[PDB]
Amino acid sequence: KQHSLRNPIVEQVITETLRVVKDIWLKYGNGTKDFFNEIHIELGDTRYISKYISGILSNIVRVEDGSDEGVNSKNIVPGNGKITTQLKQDWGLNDVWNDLILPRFERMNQLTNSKDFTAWNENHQKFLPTVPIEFSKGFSKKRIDHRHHALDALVIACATTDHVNLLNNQSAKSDTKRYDLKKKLMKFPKQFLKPWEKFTVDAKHNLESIIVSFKQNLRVINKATNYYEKYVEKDGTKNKERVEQAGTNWAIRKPMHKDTVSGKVDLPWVKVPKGKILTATRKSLDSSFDLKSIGSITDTGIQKILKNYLAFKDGNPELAFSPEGIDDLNKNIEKYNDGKPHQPINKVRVFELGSKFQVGQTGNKKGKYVEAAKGTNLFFAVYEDEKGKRSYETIPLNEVIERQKQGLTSVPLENEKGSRLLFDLSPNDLVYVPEIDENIDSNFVFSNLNKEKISRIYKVEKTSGTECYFVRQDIAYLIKQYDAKTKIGELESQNKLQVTMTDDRIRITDTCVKINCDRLGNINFITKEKIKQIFNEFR
Amino acid sequence: PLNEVIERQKQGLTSVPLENEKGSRLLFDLSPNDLVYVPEIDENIDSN
Amino acid sequence: GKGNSVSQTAERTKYRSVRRLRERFLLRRERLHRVLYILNFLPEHYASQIDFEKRLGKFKVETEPKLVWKNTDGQFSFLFQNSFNEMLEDFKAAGQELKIPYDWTIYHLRKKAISQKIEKEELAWILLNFNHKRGYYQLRGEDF
Amino acid sequence: KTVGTYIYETLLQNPKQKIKGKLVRTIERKFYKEELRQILEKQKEFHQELQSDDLYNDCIRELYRNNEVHQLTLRKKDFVHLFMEDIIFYQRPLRSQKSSVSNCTLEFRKYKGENGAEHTQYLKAIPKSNPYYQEFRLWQWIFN
Amino acid sequence: LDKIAIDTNILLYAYDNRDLDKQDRAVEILLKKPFVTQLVVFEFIKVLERRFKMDKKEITKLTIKLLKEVIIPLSLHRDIYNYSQFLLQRYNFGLSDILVLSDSILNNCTILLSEDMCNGMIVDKKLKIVNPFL
Amino acid sequence: LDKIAIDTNILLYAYDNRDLDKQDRAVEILLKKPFVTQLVVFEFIKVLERRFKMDKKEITKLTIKLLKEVIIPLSLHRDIYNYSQFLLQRYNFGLSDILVLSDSILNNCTILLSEDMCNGMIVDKKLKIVNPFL
RNA sequence: GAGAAUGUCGGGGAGCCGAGGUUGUGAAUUGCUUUCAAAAAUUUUGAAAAGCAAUUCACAAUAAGGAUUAUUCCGUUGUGAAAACAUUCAAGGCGGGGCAACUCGCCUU
DNA sequence: AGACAAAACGACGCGTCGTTTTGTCTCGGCTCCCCGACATTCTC
Ligand SMILES: [Mg+2]
Ligand SMILES: [Mg+2]
């Protein structure tokens, strides 16, 4: 049931954890009994999950013999950050993590033409990732990725109950009593024994071969039930009862547009490019009104009086347009209007040139012009013409709503030029960007995804017009964001690129191929058996 | 130009493609010595 | 970590409440139209273009009527000429101006309604105005 | 004096005054109620439509066709109560949260629905101020 | 490099069971995402309604699924009728077959697959017909 | 003022002389350049080739002549399958007729003309079926 | 570890209302620009229209839309292919409360 | 040879992908349900 926990965040986390556990059960053990011998749990406010998920998951790994009784199964072994960090340092997970993340740091070094982002060492005789102190506000080398989560999960899983007991109750009161665990788990007390000989190499191989699955919310329309009180004639008597609404009525599950509403204006003294219009909105006349912004005020006489005043104050809007300055202007409007009388001014209609759409078509709604809301450009169409060139478009939420209401596909399957649609992209999608030499037209065969193949996987982040921005799927946070002062950043000003990060710097949208993964990050592609089942399920 | 006219007429097709690359439906073809009517600025000749 | 309306459900609830208040104000207005039309208080120009049969009390579609501006051959005229004249008489007695907005007559009528006879249309305008501006009120009461 | 006449006076003395949102933003509902009352009683002696009980019953029936009980209730009132206490200043009470009250873990009830299945209705928990829970609690304290 | 088109026969053998070998070879032929005409889908619908008496809803669901995923529809060329009449003078085929070859040819297809229609016969020295089940 | 379309019925009653009055109706239905669906032309070809057993050459000539001079073919719409499936939940016609109506609607047609489609009826508040022979 | 009882600190959900703001209509006043449009010495004054406005008032809308005439609503939430749900949901009886509608308890399936 | 094909051509406007920069609805009251955490006491 919804709203059964502290807050939506932990509820979503727990629900997705359950879903992922079910998926792994089906994929790796076919849902049979006691397929999970043991489960280890860790969190790393959030403590609300440490006990609820353990209690819920006790139902799978519990033993009915009567030995395992209590609030939680004895097989569930929560840990602590001490064990995970000590194992990571001892077993070399930290070293492989730095080797995995370092190329981002060399890219930052090259982009800033310095050497301060990599530090050489001689105890390891290699370069370690690093950041300058003035870019070290809250930088963390683990946090800037997504697969660290999986790395933590791995280092937790191999940690047995003996390890957590040893590292939580190290106080022995006698060396001999705990010396058995010392000899069994640690090499001689210096370093712990690996779970197996090839642990580090296998962990490297997996970590460099993980694709991250991103949950998507493409809800545009859904069905809504309307119950309303009404007097109904039954058995010759009128009774008040609830009635369900007749006909069809959809509920939009996204904010259709932005709150601010503007009105259309036509100004002879400005040139309007085709496909764009001028919209004017009222705004307070305040200290941020300089010559360029004063020239963006729709009234010409207000512009005349206002520039006269600004000249009178030595061209300083801060002194001119303080509340005291505005009052002085209002009291003495004659000595800036060439001596002509005029009403006071506190708010003015500033105009902007761009693409704003009508909110509706009834009454006076046809005069309200709004802008698309945040996070509502959800579909990005990629088409091809018979010759071979790719065309791009972004369909607004209005056409998505109308198309989905008429039972059609969200994106038109052909553009106005007749170009056939490759496919549509949404935020959190995954695409493969092939090399410049590869010719991916009927590739498929997505079973042999190696490190080079997986490193060329990009996730959509946002779209606008014909532009689509991508981030490598393994990137969570940038090493350094963008600031208008230094004008530097990991992925330039937008913190996301329309091209690859690698040296070729190729348009991602011109060669990318959309892919589909499941909750477990396993690629999904057409196969014979699948083709058979398409219409076996109809057979 | 005359080239694609040649292979179109050789393939038994019409002289001019009946739709352009944009998919716009062909109104008609004009040849030297053809005749057209140019309606007034106010007239609306759509199915006259 | 600190907590500031961190739920999309709360935002949906806020929009729902705003909408609900809006339609309840509209419903009040509709019922006022119905009652005043029964009482024969609305003027013919206004009342001719509210639906009273299928859409009970709603305006006819694609129409924005004003109770006070009568539209004849595309021109707009004010209907309470005499109360406007009395209000301008009051201002000139106070000696301020002789040129004021027509829609200032409502407050003159509201003062006049306390102790004088006003025509019915003004009274309907006043009731609709009161429906517009209701005022703060605590449901419990509990005088302290 | 009434808030409408006060606003009219302030507009008389300062004709550049901003009323909406500047002069009066929010005031107790008692002012609007009292002003609209005084207006309606004063206009009542002069307009005969406010005395015709035929018209009053017509408004009653139109507004409450399917609720004869409410018609019977309002057949005793007049236009004053119908305008203020019914239409304009009608504020609904809070929806009941009784349905959201928790249930005891012990007492159950079983019944068979129209589907032929047998399902259980819960029993709502006791309010704490109930004297009987008072007895339970303080006997528990006596033993403790 | 070649543009593979297909006919109603490949889909019909794919759907049916009693011809396990034919159904198999049909389903591998569908793996290469072969192009299809709008005609071929139309006779697919017709034969599903006549031969197989399937209800309309399931038929439309299946055709939408296949057009989305497995087969790639091709646009209905506007010169299909003149070009189909062109092959009429030189070729001895049913007029529906002449239309399917006309639209396959006008869409730059090089190889067509089917049991019928004169295996191994090149049409206007630009399209071939291959029986793949053999 | 309204994009009027037609179906195979108008063409078929136009073709035959057995009923002079219906033939006439049909021919004055064609004088106004009524729009037409490609599926209508396909069904017309099918009925000429099947019922009437006419030669391929002359029916192809007639089709080309009519499309060049008489009726305006409408480009086949890519959303015809999904839209026809959508109309399928609320309506119960032969699926061929549902595709005809779907393609007529998707091309912005206002009035459709036919016989066996329950004249006067409104299809998704966009297009109405009219029997003109009455 | 569980249950119950008493206090402290938080979070979530639902509900009854209020005041602005914005866009548009109408009006009162005053402006900038352009054109008509005359007078006068390319320039200045005058009548009209349009475009953009500013101060004040009345009004219309305030997610596009769809119900319904109950003093009722659904539309920014979650699940997921069923475009299907969840977030109201049985029957009685024995009672308390009001001008009553309606509201609040107890008992048996 | 003369008259068609097409390249200049002087125009402005446009548009250029690449990139950065700019903008983005707001506060007020109150009621009433549920859960969570940490405090104390008693019992299994
Ligand atoms: Mg065939
Ligand atoms: Mg038919």
Coordinates of C-alpha atoms and ligand atoms in Angstrom, one line a residue, chain F residues 7-9 43 94 96-97 100 116-117, ligand 2:
Chain F
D7 CA -15.2 3.9 -50.9
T8 CA -15.2 1.0 -53.4
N9 CA -19.0 1.0 -53.4
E43 CA -10.3 -3.6 -53.2
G94 CA -15.5 -5.5 -40.8
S96 CA -11.3 -3.8 -43.8
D97 CA -14.0 -1.1 -43.4
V100 CA -10.8 2.4 -44.7
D116 CA -22.9 -1.0 -46.1
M117 CA -21.7 1.2 -43.3
Ligands
MG2 MG -15.8 -2.7 -47.3

